[PDB]
């Protein structure tokens, strides 16, 4: 046989490159996943991730309360935190024993898979009582925020998209939903009558994951990296695996 | 009057047969329910059922964590079980005090009502971090598993469909979503423009039920049987009520 | 060892100690107890008996 | 065939009688069990049974403390009861908050199986510090109490032997060991050199049982009766199953 790495008959090499390219491109086919992640960062360094993975479209929607830090199996000031919520829902509405709940997110990062079409991204960033823009009557139910998404790149390939906003002020008390649609460069509408029931089934088949990791280090090591997910850390370092035409 | 059970003028008998046939056939009309049940069996003999009942289509989606046994009002090693989850999400990722959580399901049974079309059944059986097939990039978001569904029969009538798989190995750690579409032998597409908003409303109107029963006996006696639901027990015994052309 | 002594006991952790009294009553006589579980996960799933190579196997009794 | 219950060819009847006679006589063979039960009766009506079943010989030995009522999974005044014990071991030796512990047995019944030889029965009924007769130096380590054992009879057959003594006074604070030897009408000594190691093995093979039942009713119903054990209740009623030459 020919010697490795020296000729056009390195079939092991050709197959390796195809294996990777096939994965990149499968993800972008209409048969592929589109995935969204919401990372809620807490002052103690821990991070709640909520991930949803589905065909065609995908999204996450959380209440103010659901985005607050919850330490499984530990004390959470659960009564005081009911009282905190009452004062967040209406000023001077509760009887809490703290000015600022350290369970409130300090920041949110939203990441989409590279199979999303960024122009389809929509965000409903509501107030603490789940209203998008001050009052329902004048609320558009979303903002199209794709222009703000940065490309997470590795080796020159787009491995994901990130929108990050800090919530560092006392008044940054939010509810949050986000949504993106899978790339579809074709003129086959996946929600036209021929395939619409499959999109309805995709709503039932969407897989959800949620967990609080103790530190960004741990998220990078045990959540992002093992699963070949895209990420951007606090030091603006990009994580992910470039696959297209790559060995 | 004619004597009962002796002539074609037993109207009480005719009405009884129609009453039953009407129910079988109503369920199969597009006005009818389609229902799915996920049974998660635990080593202590208890069983979590999640049921969803809706028009047109129906499905259930649960995280790894949500399928774990939770004993309401009793101790659940809640801190250790956070640690268990960390080691299930990534090997050697947690600091638990047990090798195997007895809260992990030992088996799953998926049952559909007889109004499902088995060829529409789709399952997303993911890993513990809610990925269908090892990595998102190469994951088809579902498998069409209808061929594996057994018919639950009573008196010769199909009263439901069952797919059962055990999770007896240490590595059987799953997330799970399943979906089926209601029978529609017509060429009226329920999700075409004339009726699509009704299917969107059906997503909001789907009724959910979940509860942990202490034993299969108790599930059969107090969940399955009172509600005329189909079931298949560990001894391969079929439960349900035959209705078509029956008194 | 008794039935009870072979059951799992987690030193320094919770063991459903009251419910497990009730489990034992139903194991000693069917329908004899008032437990909140069908199967106690504290029951052994298997037993291995090992002897040293200095045993005479023909003397083994169980 | 001959008609049942009318002739000497009722083989079903002959076999039934042999089946029963074989059990009575097997128990009395040297291959058979000898069994002892100690019942400790508490003021709340509950009863601790300790049973031991072995070949050749059998016995039970318990400390003062081990004979005290212990309610599994409930509160037992465990600290105060340490203090009670200190005052029982030496007068005015402890700092308890009660004059009389209701955990002290009110009575003891000792029962042997009908395979015991009553003349071999020996009892060490010690004081609270496990001394048989006031001081070790002058203590015989047992008393041969067989003469006091009453026969528990059913249908004229000896189904067991009972010695019962109440402990109704404040000073009845005891330690207790009892022992009996299996019938051996032969001149083959089971502890002579030919079989002595088998008796040593019988010491390891003796099976023990202990449990606190809530009432004498419950002991009769769920302990004594299901297992064909002999008993004598507070109303002097005999329980057991006659087997010799019986259908
Ligand atoms: N400035 C301000 N914003 C409020 C207040 N209450 C709610 N908000 C919301 O805060 C959102 C903007 O959040 P931020 O960007 O963290 O506040 P900012 O004033 O821009 O401060 P910087 O981002 O740090 O420059 C707006 O969309 C408002 O709807 C308030 O009392 N003052
Ligand atoms: N065999 C194996 N399967 C794994 C492992 N990790 C995850 N799995 C998943 O296990 C799934 C199959 O589960 P099982 O059917 O219970 O395993 P099995 O090897 O077929 O064992 P049996 O079903 O009892 O014959 C596969 O789809 C794998 O994706 C692993 O380390 N070994
Ligand atoms: N009488 C008496 N017996 C004691 C005392 N201390 C220990 N004992 C033991 O109590 C045992 C006898 O118990 P009982 O039969 O309940 O006492 P009793 O005086 O015979 O009273 P009755 O049996 O009700 O007639 C004796 O063997 C003594 O060793 C004590 O202070 N007085
Ligand atoms: N919508 C898209 N989805 C996936 N890949 C894309 C998309 N658009 C361009 N690419 C490819 O991704 C790689 C990077 O292109 P891109 O335009 O992001 O890089 P750039 O010009 O260096 O940076 P930027 O546009 O962010 O300033 C190229 O191979 C490009 O063909
Ligand atoms: N998709 C269906 N939905 C409901 N009923 C059906 C369907 N297909 C067939 N039936 C009816 O159900 C009854 C049983 O038919 P079926 O083919 O399941 O039984 P079978 O041939 O004895 O068993 P099997 O096909 O499982 O080997 C018949 O009345 C049949 O007409
Ligand atoms: N040591 C023994 N073991 C077993 N059975 C015996 C023993 N001695 C006698 N028996 C038998 O038990 C039955 C009852 O005999 P037993 O002498 O106990 O009754 P009794 O004379 O009516 O009453 P008691 O001797 O208690 O005043 C008879 O069949 C007798 O042969
Ligand atoms: N504004 C507040 C806050 C707390 N408490 C009291 O604080 C007690 C315990 O604190 P809690 O808020 O419940 O937190 P933890 O018990 O410490 O932690 P967790 O409840 O999450 O286990 C509660 O009984 C509650 O009555 C109160 O009276 N008023
Ligand atoms: N790997 C572990 C597991 C448990 N614990 C400690 O175990 C204590 C109590 O056990 P827990 O896991 O919380 O279970 P339970 O309290 O018995 O039951 P539950 O919390 O569900 O009421 C907790 O305070 C926790 O700190 C720990 O330190 N490390
Ligand atoms: N069949 C049962 C089982 C439990 N309980 C109640 O459950 C409470 C606490 O559960 P327990 O069985 O005692 O287990 P744990 O306290 O969680 O753990 P452990 O007692 O071993 O520390 C007890 O007070 C008991 O009264 C009950 O009433 N009936
Ligand atoms: N003579 C005594 C008796 C009891 N106590 C105190 O009583 C408290 C609780 O009573 P306890 O004797 O321990 O019984 P319970 O806790 O009610 O039941 P248990 O310990 O068996 O669970 C203990 O902390 C112990 O310090 C004491 O100081 N002095
Ligand atoms: Cl495609
Ligand atoms: Cl219809
Ligand atoms: Cl013999
Ligand atoms: Mg706890
Ligand atoms: Mg609290
Ligand atoms: Mg307890
Ligand atoms: Mg105590």
PDB file of N, CA and C in Angstrom, chain A residues 9-67:
ATOM      1  N   UNK A   9      -4.164   8.263  -2.162  1.00  0.00           N
ATOM      2  CA  UNK A   9      -4.748   6.987  -1.766  1.00  0.00           C
ATOM      3  C   UNK A   9      -4.711   6.780  -0.251  1.00  0.00           C
ATOM      4  N   UNK A  10      -4.548   7.858   0.513  1.00  0.00           N
ATOM      5  CA  UNK A  10      -4.714   7.767   1.957  1.00  0.00           C
ATOM      6  C   UNK A  10      -6.222   7.771   2.260  1.00  0.00           C
ATOM      7  N   UNK A  11      -6.828   6.591   2.123  1.00  0.00           N
ATOM      8  CA  UNK A  11      -8.277   6.479   2.278  1.00  0.00           C
ATOM      9  C   UNK A  11      -8.708   6.686   3.731  1.00  0.00           C
ATOM     10  N   UNK A  12      -7.895   6.232   4.679  1.00  0.00           N
ATOM     11  CA  UNK A  12      -8.145   6.510   6.090  1.00  0.00           C
ATOM     12  C   UNK A  12      -8.271   8.033   6.322  1.00  0.00           C
ATOM     13  N   UNK A  13      -7.408   8.801   5.679  1.00  0.00           N
ATOM     14  CA  UNK A  13      -7.426  10.262   5.787  1.00  0.00           C
ATOM     15  C   UNK A  13      -8.643  10.880   5.121  1.00  0.00           C
ATOM     16  N   UNK A  14      -8.995  10.386   3.933  1.00  0.00           N
ATOM     17  CA  UNK A  14     -10.174  10.860   3.202  1.00  0.00           C
ATOM     18  C   UNK A  14     -11.443  10.575   3.972  1.00  0.00           C
ATOM     19  N   UNK A  15     -11.522   9.365   4.518  1.00  0.00           N
ATOM     20  CA  UNK A  15     -12.679   8.980   5.321  1.00  0.00           C
ATOM     21  C   UNK A  15     -12.785   9.803   6.608  1.00  0.00           C
ATOM     22  N   UNK A  16     -11.648  10.124   7.206  1.00  0.00           N
ATOM     23  CA  UNK A  16     -11.673  10.907   8.418  1.00  0.00           C
ATOM     24  C   UNK A  16     -12.228  12.290   8.100  1.00  0.00           C
ATOM     25  N   UNK A  17     -11.768  12.875   7.009  1.00  0.00           N
ATOM     26  CA  UNK A  17     -12.231  14.211   6.621  1.00  0.00           C
ATOM     27  C   UNK A  17     -13.726  14.201   6.267  1.00  0.00           C
ATOM     28  N   UNK A  18     -14.171  13.165   5.568  1.00  0.00           N
ATOM     29  CA  UNK A  18     -15.582  13.019   5.248  1.00  0.00           C
ATOM     30  C   UNK A  18     -16.449  12.835   6.479  1.00  0.00           C
ATOM     31  N   UNK A  19     -15.965  12.044   7.437  1.00  0.00           N
ATOM     32  CA  UNK A  19     -16.675  11.783   8.678  1.00  0.00           C
ATOM     33  C   UNK A  19     -16.979  13.093   9.403  1.00  0.00           C
ATOM     34  N   UNK A  20     -15.986  13.960   9.463  1.00  0.00           N
ATOM     35  CA  UNK A  20     -16.154  15.259  10.097  1.00  0.00           C
ATOM     36  C   UNK A  20     -17.076  16.178   9.275  1.00  0.00           C
ATOM     37  N   UNK A  21     -16.847  16.253   7.968  1.00  0.00           N
ATOM     38  CA  UNK A  21     -17.640  17.121   7.094  1.00  0.00           C
ATOM     39  C   UNK A  21     -19.096  16.689   7.111  1.00  0.00           C
ATOM     40  N   UNK A  22     -19.337  15.384   7.127  1.00  0.00           N
ATOM     41  CA  UNK A  22     -20.685  14.817   7.199  1.00  0.00           C
ATOM     42  C   UNK A  22     -21.425  15.276   8.455  1.00  0.00           C
ATOM     43  N   UNK A  23     -20.739  15.292   9.586  1.00  0.00           N
ATOM     44  CA  UNK A  23     -21.341  15.797  10.820  1.00  0.00           C
ATOM     45  C   UNK A  23     -21.711  17.297  10.712  1.00  0.00           C
ATOM     46  N   UNK A  24     -20.781  18.151  10.287  1.00  0.00           N
ATOM     47  CA  UNK A  24     -21.078  19.590  10.113  1.00  0.00           C
ATOM     48  C   UNK A  24     -22.310  19.775   9.253  1.00  0.00           C
ATOM     49  N   UNK A  25     -22.297  19.123   8.106  1.00  0.00           N
ATOM     50  CA  UNK A  25     -23.378  19.275   7.144  1.00  0.00           C
ATOM     51  C   UNK A  25     -24.674  18.587   7.558  1.00  0.00           C
ATOM     52  N   UNK A  26     -24.617  17.417   8.202  1.00  0.00           N
ATOM     53  CA  UNK A  26     -25.850  16.796   8.734  1.00  0.00           C
ATOM     54  C   UNK A  26     -26.588  17.764   9.679  1.00  0.00           C
ATOM     55  N   UNK A  27     -25.834  18.386  10.574  1.00  0.00           N
ATOM     56  CA  UNK A  27     -26.395  19.315  11.556  1.00  0.00           C
ATOM     57  C   UNK A  27     -27.167  20.430  10.838  1.00  0.00           C
ATOM     58  N   UNK A  28     -26.631  20.903   9.701  1.00  0.00           N
ATOM     59  CA  UNK A  28     -27.270  21.957   8.888  1.00  0.00           C
ATOM     60  C   UNK A  28     -28.380  21.491   7.934  1.00  0.00           C
ATOM     61  N   UNK A  29     -28.521  20.172   7.749  1.00  0.00           N
ATOM     62  CA  UNK A  29     -29.630  19.629   6.974  1.00  0.00           C
ATOM     63  C   UNK A  29     -30.905  19.812   7.778  1.00  0.00           C
ATOM     64  N   UNK A  30     -32.054  19.673   7.120  1.00  0.00           N
ATOM     65  CA  UNK A  30     -33.336  19.782   7.791  1.00  0.00           C
ATOM     66  C   UNK A  30     -33.631  18.574   8.683  1.00  0.00           C
ATOM     67  N   UNK A  31     -32.835  17.515   8.514  1.00  0.00           N
ATOM     68  CA  UNK A  31     -32.868  16.347   9.376  1.00  0.00           C
ATOM     69  C   UNK A  31     -32.139  16.610  10.691  1.00  0.00           C
ATOM     70  N   UNK A  32     -31.419  17.725  10.773  1.00  0.00           N
ATOM     71  CA  UNK A  32     -30.522  17.985  11.893  1.00  0.00           C
ATOM     72  C   UNK A  32     -31.099  18.788  13.048  1.00  0.00           C
ATOM     73  N   UNK A  33     -30.344  18.779  14.133  1.00  0.00           N
ATOM     74  CA  UNK A  33     -30.687  19.513  15.338  1.00  0.00           C
ATOM     75  C   UNK A  33     -30.495  21.011  15.160  1.00  0.00           C
ATOM     76  N   UNK A  34     -31.313  21.785  15.865  1.00  0.00           N
ATOM     77  CA  UNK A  34     -30.946  23.147  16.233  1.00  0.00           C
ATOM     78  C   UNK A  34     -31.080  23.237  17.766  1.00  0.00           C
ATOM     79  N   UNK A  35     -30.107  23.895  18.388  1.00  0.00           N
ATOM     80  CA  UNK A  35     -29.961  23.859  19.819  1.00  0.00           C
ATOM     81  C   UNK A  35     -29.731  25.250  20.366  1.00  0.00           C
ATOM     82  N   UNK A  36     -30.309  25.497  21.535  1.00  0.00           N
ATOM     83  CA  UNK A  36     -30.131  26.760  22.241  1.00  0.00           C
ATOM     84  C   UNK A  36     -29.722  26.467  23.679  1.00  0.00           C
ATOM     85  N   UNK A  37     -28.885  27.343  24.218  1.00  0.00           N
ATOM     86  CA  UNK A  37     -28.460  27.284  25.592  1.00  0.00           C
ATOM     87  C   UNK A  37     -28.651  28.656  26.222  1.00  0.00           C
ATOM     88  N   UNK A  38     -29.211  28.676  27.430  1.00  0.00           N
ATOM     89  CA  UNK A  38     -29.257  29.877  28.279  1.00  0.00           C
ATOM     90  C   UNK A  38     -28.403  29.571  29.490  1.00  0.00           C
ATOM     91  N   UNK A  39     -27.398  30.420  29.709  1.00  0.00           N
ATOM     92  CA  UNK A  39     -26.521  30.339  30.863  1.00  0.00           C
ATOM     93  C   UNK A  39     -26.848  31.505  31.770  1.00  0.00           C
ATOM     94  N   UNK A  40     -27.192  31.209  33.014  1.00  0.00           N
ATOM     95  CA  UNK A  40     -27.457  32.232  34.005  1.00  0.00           C
ATOM     96  C   UNK A  40     -26.357  32.148  35.062  1.00  0.00           C
ATOM     97  N   UNK A  41     -25.583  33.234  35.167  1.00  0.00           N
ATOM     98  CA  UNK A  41     -24.397  33.317  36.004  1.00  0.00           C
ATOM     99  C   UNK A  41     -24.707  33.937  37.355  1.00  0.00           C
ATOM    100  N   UNK A  42     -24.277  33.271  38.431  1.00  0.00           N
ATOM    101  CA  UNK A  42     -24.566  33.775  39.772  1.00  0.00           C
ATOM    102  C   UNK A  42     -23.311  34.309  40.426  1.00  0.00           C
ATOM    103  N   UNK A  43     -23.512  35.166  41.425  1.00  0.00           N
ATOM    104  CA  UNK A  43     -22.420  35.846  42.097  1.00  0.00           C
ATOM    105  C   UNK A  43     -21.477  34.879  42.802  1.00  0.00           C
ATOM    106  N   UNK A  44     -21.959  33.707  43.217  1.00  0.00           N
ATOM    107  CA  UNK A  44     -21.094  32.695  43.842  1.00  0.00           C
ATOM    108  C   UNK A  44     -20.241  31.917  42.839  1.00  0.00           C
ATOM    109  N   UNK A  45     -20.302  32.322  41.573  1.00  0.00           N
ATOM    110  CA  UNK A  45     -19.513  31.679  40.541  1.00  0.00           C
ATOM    111  C   UNK A  45     -20.201  30.513  39.859  1.00  0.00           C
ATOM    112  N   UNK A  46     -21.324  30.049  40.406  1.00  0.00           N
ATOM    113  CA  UNK A  46     -22.037  28.968  39.790  1.00  0.00           C
ATOM    114  C   UNK A  46     -22.825  29.455  38.572  1.00  0.00           C
ATOM    115  N   UNK A  47     -23.241  28.493  37.749  1.00  0.00           N
ATOM    116  CA  UNK A  47     -23.889  28.761  36.493  1.00  0.00           C
ATOM    117  C   UNK A  47     -24.992  27.722  36.242  1.00  0.00           C
ATOM    118  N   UNK A  48     -26.217  28.202  36.024  1.00  0.00           N
ATOM    119  CA  UNK A  48     -27.334  27.356  35.637  1.00  0.00           C
ATOM    120  C   UNK A  48     -27.312  27.318  34.118  1.00  0.00           C
ATOM    121  N   UNK A  49     -27.264  26.131  33.527  1.00  0.00           N
ATOM    122  CA  UNK A  49     -27.493  26.020  32.105  1.00  0.00           C
ATOM    123  C   UNK A  49     -28.842  25.374  31.898  1.00  0.00           C
ATOM    124  N   UNK A  50     -29.583  25.913  30.941  1.00  0.00           N
ATOM    125  CA  UNK A  50     -30.760  25.290  30.362  1.00  0.00           C
ATOM    126  C   UNK A  50     -30.460  25.145  28.885  1.00  0.00           C
ATOM    127  N   UNK A  51     -30.591  23.921  28.383  1.00  0.00           N
ATOM    128  CA  UNK A  51     -30.359  23.604  26.998  1.00  0.00           C
ATOM    129  C   UNK A  51     -31.621  22.978  26.431  1.00  0.00           C
ATOM    130  N   UNK A  52     -31.963  23.337  25.209  1.00  0.00           N
ATOM    131  CA  UNK A  52     -32.976  22.594  24.464  1.00  0.00           C
ATOM    132  C   UNK A  52     -32.484  22.276  23.051  1.00  0.00           C
ATOM    133  N   UNK A  53     -32.739  21.034  22.640  1.00  0.00           N
ATOM    134  CA  UNK A  53     -32.291  20.464  21.384  1.00  0.00           C
ATOM    135  C   UNK A  53     -33.516  19.953  20.636  1.00  0.00           C
ATOM    136  N   UNK A  54     -33.759  20.489  19.447  1.00  0.00           N
ATOM    137  CA  UNK A  54     -34.880  20.029  18.671  1.00  0.00           C
ATOM    138  C   UNK A  54     -34.652  20.205  17.197  1.00  0.00           C
ATOM    139  N   UNK A  55     -35.487  19.541  16.416  1.00  0.00           N
ATOM    140  CA  UNK A  55     -35.487  19.713  14.978  1.00  0.00           C
ATOM    141  C   UNK A  55     -36.311  20.960  14.650  1.00  0.00           C
ATOM    142  N   UNK A  56     -35.960  21.609  13.541  1.00  0.00           N
ATOM    143  CA  UNK A  56     -36.739  22.687  12.886  1.00  0.00           C
ATOM    144  C   UNK A  56     -36.672  24.053  13.532  1.00  0.00           C
ATOM    145  N   UNK A  57     -36.969  24.080  14.835  1.00  0.00           N
ATOM    146  CA  UNK A  57     -36.984  25.286  15.664  1.00  0.00           C
ATOM    147  C   UNK A  57     -36.677  24.875  17.101  1.00  0.00           C
ATOM    148  N   UNK A  58     -36.297  25.828  17.944  1.00  0.00           N
ATOM    149  CA  UNK A  58     -36.045  25.509  19.332  1.00  0.00           C
ATOM    150  C   UNK A  58     -36.122  26.792  20.155  1.00  0.00           C
ATOM    151  N   UNK A  59     -36.483  26.642  21.416  1.00  0.00           N
ATOM    152  CA  UNK A  59     -36.541  27.766  22.324  1.00  0.00           C
ATOM    153  C   UNK A  59     -36.630  27.380  23.787  1.00  0.00           C
ATOM    154  N   UNK A  60     -36.402  28.381  24.630  1.00  0.00           N
ATOM    155  CA  UNK A  60     -36.467  28.237  26.061  1.00  0.00           C
ATOM    156  C   UNK A  60     -37.239  29.414  26.586  1.00  0.00           C
ATOM    157  N   UNK A  61     -38.079  29.178  27.592  1.00  0.00           N
ATOM    158  CA  UNK A  61     -38.820  30.243  28.264  1.00  0.00           C
ATOM    159  C   UNK A  61     -38.810  29.973  29.770  1.00  0.00           C
ATOM    160  N   UNK A  62     -38.376  30.961  30.543  1.00  0.00           N
ATOM    161  CA  UNK A  62     -38.244  30.823  31.994  1.00  0.00           C
ATOM    162  C   UNK A  62     -38.823  32.042  32.718  1.00  0.00           C
ATOM    163  N   UNK A  63     -39.429  31.801  33.879  1.00  0.00           N
ATOM    164  CA  UNK A  63     -39.872  32.865  34.735  1.00  0.00           C
ATOM    165  C   UNK A  63     -38.676  33.511  35.443  1.00  0.00           C
ATOM    166  N   UNK A  64     -38.908  34.712  35.987  1.00  0.00           N
ATOM    167  CA  UNK A  64     -37.943  35.352  36.896  1.00  0.00           C
ATOM    168  C   UNK A  64     -37.485  34.358  37.964  1.00  0.00           C
ATOM    169  N   UNK A  65     -38.461  33.720  38.599  1.00  0.00           N
ATOM    170  CA  UNK A  65     -38.185  32.807  39.688  1.00  0.00           C
ATOM    171  C   UNK A  65     -37.364  31.611  39.219  1.00  0.00           C
ATOM    172  N   UNK A  66     -37.668  31.077  38.044  1.00  0.00           N
ATOM    173  CA  UNK A  66     -37.004  29.848  37.591  1.00  0.00           C
ATOM    174  C   UNK A  66     -35.541  30.072  37.223  1.00  0.00           C
ATOM    175  N   UNK A  67     -35.184  31.327  36.948  1.00  0.00           N
ATOM    176  CA  UNK A  67     -33.818  31.668  36.620  1.00  0.00           C
ATOM    177  C   UNK A  67     -32.969  31.939  37.865  1.00  0.00           C
TER     178      UNK A  67
END
